[PDB]
Scaffold this active site. Structure first.
Site, PDB file in Angstrom:
ATOM      1  N   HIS A  62      11.643  10.707   5.287  1.00  0.00           N
ATOM      2  CA  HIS A  62      10.564  10.688   6.276  1.00  0.00           C
ATOM      3  C   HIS A  62      10.632  11.929   7.190  1.00  0.00           C
ATOM      4  O   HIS A  62      10.796  11.826   8.413  1.00  0.00           O
ATOM      5  CB  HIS A  62      10.570   9.389   7.089  1.00  0.00           C
ATOM      6  CG  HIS A  62      10.190   8.174   6.295  1.00  0.00           C
ATOM      7  ND1 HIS A  62      11.128   7.333   5.740  1.00  0.00           N
ATOM      8  CD2 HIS A  62       8.982   7.689   5.916  1.00  0.00           C
ATOM      9  CE1 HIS A  62      10.516   6.358   5.085  1.00  0.00           C
ATOM     10  NE2 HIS A  62       9.216   6.544   5.181  1.00  0.00           N
ATOM     11  N   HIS A 100       1.858  11.381  11.032  1.00  0.00           N
ATOM     12  CA  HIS A 100       1.930   9.931  10.941  1.00  0.00           C
ATOM     13  C   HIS A 100       3.346   9.352  10.976  1.00  0.00           C
ATOM     14  O   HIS A 100       3.488   8.150  11.133  1.00  0.00           O
ATOM     15  CB  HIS A 100       1.237   9.403   9.679  1.00  0.00           C
ATOM     16  CG  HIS A 100       2.097   9.474   8.467  1.00  0.00           C
ATOM     17  ND1 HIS A 100       2.208  10.626   7.709  1.00  0.00           N
ATOM     18  CD2 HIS A 100       2.938   8.567   7.911  1.00  0.00           C
ATOM     19  CE1 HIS A 100       3.075  10.411   6.733  1.00  0.00           C
ATOM     20  NE2 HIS A 100       3.532   9.178   6.842  1.00  0.00           N
ATOM     21  N   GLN A 263      12.201  -0.739  -8.771  1.00  0.00           N
ATOM     22  CA  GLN A 263      11.019   0.090  -8.892  1.00  0.00           C
ATOM     23  C   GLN A 263       9.923  -0.689  -9.609  1.00  0.00           C
ATOM     24  O   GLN A 263       8.762  -0.686  -9.174  1.00  0.00           O
ATOM     25  CB  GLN A 263      11.355   1.414  -9.624  1.00  0.00           C
ATOM     26  CG  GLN A 263      12.241   2.327  -8.807  1.00  0.00           C
ATOM     27  CD  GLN A 263      11.457   2.944  -7.655  1.00  0.00           C
ATOM     28  OE1 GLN A 263      10.413   3.556  -7.881  1.00  0.00           O
ATOM     29  NE2 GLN A 263      11.897   2.691  -6.430  1.00  0.00           N
TER      30      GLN A 263
HETATM   31  C1  LIG Z   1       8.618   4.767  -4.730  1.00  0.00           C
HETATM   32  O1  LIG Z   1       9.514   3.764  -4.301  1.00  0.00           O
HETATM   33  C2  LIG Z   1       9.294   3.273  -3.055  1.00  0.00           C
HETATM   34  C3  LIG Z   1       8.505   3.896  -2.093  1.00  0.00           C
HETATM   35  C4  LIG Z   1       8.351   3.319  -0.821  1.00  0.00           C
HETATM   36  N1  LIG Z   1       7.601   3.918   0.108  1.00  0.00           N
HETATM   37  C5  LIG Z   1       7.436   3.390   1.304  1.00  0.00           C
HETATM   38  N2  LIG Z   1       8.001   2.246   1.665  1.00  0.00           N
HETATM   39  C6  LIG Z   1       8.769   1.556   0.814  1.00  0.00           C
HETATM   40  N3  LIG Z   1       9.375   0.402   1.278  1.00  0.00           N
HETATM   41  C7  LIG Z   1       9.136   0.089   2.706  1.00  0.00           C
HETATM   42  C8  LIG Z   1       9.618  -1.371   2.844  1.00  0.00           C
HETATM   43  C9  LIG Z   1       9.470  -2.034   1.443  1.00  0.00           C
HETATM   44  O2  LIG Z   1       8.379  -2.992   1.410  1.00  0.00           O
HETATM   45  C10 LIG Z   1       8.254  -3.649   0.198  1.00  0.00           C
HETATM   46  C11 LIG Z   1       7.164  -4.528   0.057  1.00  0.00           C
HETATM   47  C12 LIG Z   1       6.957  -5.214  -1.114  1.00  0.00           C
HETATM   48  C13 LIG Z   1       7.831  -5.072  -2.227  1.00  0.00           C
HETATM   49  C14 LIG Z   1       7.647  -5.781  -3.427  1.00  0.00           C
HETATM   50  C15 LIG Z   1       8.557  -5.574  -4.436  1.00  0.00           C
HETATM   51  C16 LIG Z   1       9.658  -4.692  -4.313  1.00  0.00           C
HETATM   52  C17 LIG Z   1       9.847  -3.997  -3.170  1.00  0.00           C
HETATM   53  C18 LIG Z   1       8.942  -4.181  -2.105  1.00  0.00           C
HETATM   54  C19 LIG Z   1       9.126  -3.496  -0.885  1.00  0.00           C
HETATM   55  C20 LIG Z   1       9.197  -0.826   0.478  1.00  0.00           C
HETATM   56  C21 LIG Z   1       8.989   2.089  -0.515  1.00  0.00           C
HETATM   57  C22 LIG Z   1       9.794   1.487  -1.523  1.00  0.00           C
HETATM   58  C23 LIG Z   1       9.955   2.053  -2.774  1.00  0.00           C
HETATM   59  O3  LIG Z   1      10.703   1.530  -3.838  1.00  0.00           O
HETATM   60  C24 LIG Z   1      11.519   0.350  -3.658  1.00  0.00           C
HETATM   61 MG   LIG Z   2       5.832   5.695   8.407  1.00  0.00          MG
HETATM   62 ZN   LIG Z   3       5.022   8.238   5.781  1.00  0.00          ZN
END
Ligand SMILES: COc1cc2ncnc(N3CC[C@@H](Oc4ccc5ccccc5c4)C3)c2cc1OC
Ligand SMILES: [Mg+2]
Ligand SMILES: [Zn+2]
Length: 304
Positions: A62, A100, A263
Site C-alpha cells: 500500500h 486513496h 487466491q
Molecule cells: C490479489 O490477492 C488479494 C488482493 C487483495 N487486495 C485487497 N484486499 C485484500 N484483502 C483485504 C481483506 C480481505 O477481504 C477478503 C474478503 C473476502 C474474501 C473471500 C475469500 C478469500 C479471501 C477474502 C478476503 C482481502 C486482498 C486479498 C488478496 O488475496 C487473498
Molecule cells: Mg485502502
Molecule cells: Zn488501495
C-alpha cells in the site's frame, strides 16, 4: 513521454515500471489526456503530486506505486468509456485514486481496532479510508497546493464530495453490499446512470476494480505483486500473534502453503464477481475480466 509508454499506457494491463521519478509525469499525462492540458495549473499540480508522494510510506504494497497503479486503472476505464463521466468526475476520480491510501501503514482496519489505535476512536468505521480522505484535504489546504482553486466554491465542494465517496468505497468491506445492489439493479433493468445514488455505486465499483487491479495484469506481474500483498498480511499476522490473537490463515505466514487455495477463494468470492458486474455495466472493461479469469486459471494450474 517515451514512445513505448505512450502506446502501452492505453492497455488495462500496463505496469508503471520501477522508475519512481517517471510516475508523476505518467500521472500528469493521464490527467491531461482525460481532461485538457488547460485545466490544472502545471506548477500547482506538480507540487500537489510531490506532497502526496511524500505522505505515502515505504511499506511493501500500500505504497506510492500502488496509488499510481490504481490511478492508471481508472484512467484506462475512463478512456474506454468516453462520454459517461463529466470533466469534474474524471479529474476527481483520478485525484481520488492517487490519494486513496495516503499515509497507509500496511495494516487493516481490523488490526487498528484490535490494537485500539487512536484512529479507530476517531473513525469507527472505514477507519483508514476516513484517514486517507482527511490527509487528502490537509494536503489541498497547504499553501500553493489547491489544485481546485479555479473552481467555484460549489464545484470545489462537489469535487471533494466525489473524492470522499470514492476513497471511502475503497474499503473492501463495503464492496460486497455495493456489488449486490448493483447486480440486483442490472438484472431487473433498474440501473439508471442519471440517478446520483446509482452513479455513486457504479463509481464505487470502479474504485474496487481499480484497487484490486493487480489481478488483471499479465501473470508475471500478478504473481510478483502477490508477494508484496502477502508481505503486509504476514507482518499484520505477526502483530496479531503479538497482541495474543491467532490471525486468520491469510495473515499467518505459517500457512503460506495455502496461498493458492486462498487466491482461489478470493478470485471466486471477490475479483471475478467484481469484474463480471463492472463488465455488465461498462462493457468496454471486459479486458479486466478476461485477465482476471486467465489469472484464476494460473492459480488453478499452481494447485495441480
Ligand atoms: C490479489 O490477492 C488479494 C488482493 C487483495 N487486495 C485487497 N484486499 C485484500 N484483502 C483485504 C481483506 C480481505 O477481504 C477478503 C474478503 C473476502 C474474501 C473471500 C475469500 C478469500 C479471501 C477474502 C478476503 C482481502 C486482498 C486479498 C488478496 O488475496 C487473498
Ligand atoms: Mg485502502
Ligand atoms: Zn488501495
Amino acid at each position: 513521454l517515451p514512445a513505448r509508454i505512450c502506446r502501452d499506457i492505453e492497455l488495462f494491463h500496463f505496469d508503471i515500471g520501477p522508475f519512481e521519478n517517471m510516475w508523476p509525469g505518467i500521472f500528469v499525462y493521464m490527467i491531461h489526456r482525460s481532461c485538457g492540458t488547460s485545466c490544472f495549473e502545471l506548477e500547482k499540480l506538480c507540487r500537489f503530486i510531490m506532497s502526496v508522494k511524500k505522505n505515502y510510506r515505504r511499506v511493501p504494497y500500500h505504497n506510492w506505486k500502488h496509488a499510481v497503479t490504481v490511478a492508471h486503472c481508472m484512467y484506462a476505464i475512463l478512456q474506454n468509456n468516453n462520454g459517461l463521466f463529466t470533466d469534474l468526475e474524471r479529474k476527481g476520480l483520478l485525484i481520488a485514486c492517487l490519494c486513496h491510501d495516503l499515509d497507509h501503514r500496511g495494516f487493516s482496519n481490523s488490526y487498528l481496532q484490535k490494537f485500539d489505535h487512536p484512529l479507530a476512536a476517531l473513525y469507527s468505521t472505514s477507519t483508514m479510508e476516513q484517514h486517507h480522505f482527511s490527509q487528502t484535504v490537509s494536503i489541498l489546504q497547504l499553501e500553493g497546493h489547491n489544485i481546485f482553486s479555479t473552481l467555484s466554491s460549489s464545484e470545489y465542494e462537489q469535487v471533494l464530495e466525489i473524492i470522499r465517496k470514492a476513497i471511502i468505497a475503497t474499503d473492501l468491506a463495503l464492496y460486497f453490499g455495493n456489488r449486490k445492489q448493483l447486480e440486483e439493479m442490472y438484472q431487473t433493468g433498474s440501473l439508471n446512470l442519471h440517478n446520483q445514488s446509482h452513479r455513486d455505486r457504479v463509481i464505487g465499483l470502479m474504485m474496487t476494480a481499480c484497487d484490486l487491479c493487480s489481478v488483471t495484469k499479465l501473470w508475471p506481474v500478478t504473481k510478483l505483486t502477490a508477494n508484496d500483498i502477502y508481505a503486509e498480511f504476514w507482518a499484520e499476522g505477526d502483530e496479531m500473534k503479538k497482541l495474543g490473537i491467532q490471525p486468520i490463515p491469510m495473515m499467518d505466514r505459517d500457512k503460506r502453503d495455502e496461498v493458492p487455495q486462498g487466491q482461489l477463494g478470493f478470485y471466486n468470492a471477490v475479483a471475478i464477481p467484481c469484474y463480471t458486474t463492472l463488465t455488465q455495466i461498462l462493457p468496454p472493461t471486459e479486458p479486466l475480466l478476461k485477465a482476471c479469469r486467465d489469472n484464476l486459471n494460473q492459480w488453478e494450474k499452481v494447485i495441480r
